[PDB]
Amino acid sequence: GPSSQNVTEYVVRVPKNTTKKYNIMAFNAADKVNFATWNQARLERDLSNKPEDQPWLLRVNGKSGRKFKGIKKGGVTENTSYYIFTQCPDGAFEAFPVHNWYNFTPLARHRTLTAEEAEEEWERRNKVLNHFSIMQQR
Amino acid sequence: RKLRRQMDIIVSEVSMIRDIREREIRIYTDAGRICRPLLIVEKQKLLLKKRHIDQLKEREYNNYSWQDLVASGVVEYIDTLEEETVMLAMTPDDLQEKEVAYCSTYTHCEIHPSMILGVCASIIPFPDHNQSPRNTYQSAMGKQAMG
Amino acid sequence: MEPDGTYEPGFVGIRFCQECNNMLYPKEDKENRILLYACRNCDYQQEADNSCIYVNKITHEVDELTQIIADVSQDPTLPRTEDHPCQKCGHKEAVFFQSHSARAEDAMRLYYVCTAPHCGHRWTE
Ligand SMILES: [Zn+2]
Ligand SMILES: [Zn+2]
Q: Are residues C71 and C123 in the same domain?
A: yes
Q: Are residues C62 and C122 in the same domain?
A: yes
- C interface test, pick of B23, B105, B106, B108 with most C CB neighbours within 10 Å: B105
Torsion over CA: B134, B135, B140, B145 (sign): positive
Q: Are residues C46 and C72 in the same domain?
A: no
Q: Are residues C65 and C33 in the same domain?
A: no
User: How were these coordinates obtained?
Assistant: cryo-EM
Torsion over CA: B117, B118, B121, B122 (sign): positive
Looking at the DSSP bridge assignments, the partners of residue B46 are B41
Q: Please enumerate in sequence order all residues whose Cβ is within 8 A of that of B41, keeping only pairs 6 or more positions apart, or say none.
A: B47, B89, B95, B106, B107, B108, B109
Q: Are residues C47 and C69 in the same domain?
A: no
Q: Which of A93, A72, A62, A94 is nearest to A25 (CA)?
A: A72
Query: What is the tally of structural domains in chain C?
Result: 2
- In chain A, residues with a C-beta closer than 8 Å to the C-beta of C20 are 108, 111
Q: Are residues C26 and C38 in the same domain?
A: yes
Q: Are residues C70 and C107 in the same domain?
A: yes
Nearest ligand to the CA of C25 is 1
Q: Are residues C52 and C63 in the same domain?
A: no
Beta strands in chain C (DSSP E): 25-29, 34-38, 45-47, 80-81, 94-98, 110-114, 122-124
Task: State the Cα–Cα distance between residues B66 and B52, nearest whole angstrom.
Answer: 11
Q: Are residues C11 and C50 in the same domain?
A: yes
Cβ-contact B47, B39 below 8 angstroms: yes
Decide which of C10, C32, C56 is a domain's last residue.
C56
DSSP state of A132: H
CATH of the domain at C116: 2.20.25.10
From the CB of residue A104, how many other CB atoms can be counted at a distance below 10 Å?
A: 22
User: Cα(A117) to centroid of ligand 1, in Å?
Assistant: 22
Task: State the Cα–Cα distance between residues B121 and B141, nearest whole angstrom.
Answer: 11
Q: Are residues C70 and C117 in the same domain?
A: yes
- In chain C, residues with a C-beta closer than 8 Å to the C-beta of B102 are 79
Our CA angle for B71, B77, B83, nearest 5°, is: 145
Decide which of C36, C56, C76 is a domain's last residue.
C56
Domain that holds residue C83: 57-125
Decide which of C56, C73, C97 is a domain's last residue.
C56
- In chain A, residues with a C-beta closer than 8 Å to the C-beta of C17 are none
Cβ-contact A94, A85 below 8 angstroms: yes
Residues 17 through 46 of chain C touching chain A, CB cutoff 8 Å? 20-21, 40-42
Cβ-contact C100, C122 below 8 angstroms: no
Q: With an 8 Å Cβ cutoff, is A135 touching chain C?
A: yes
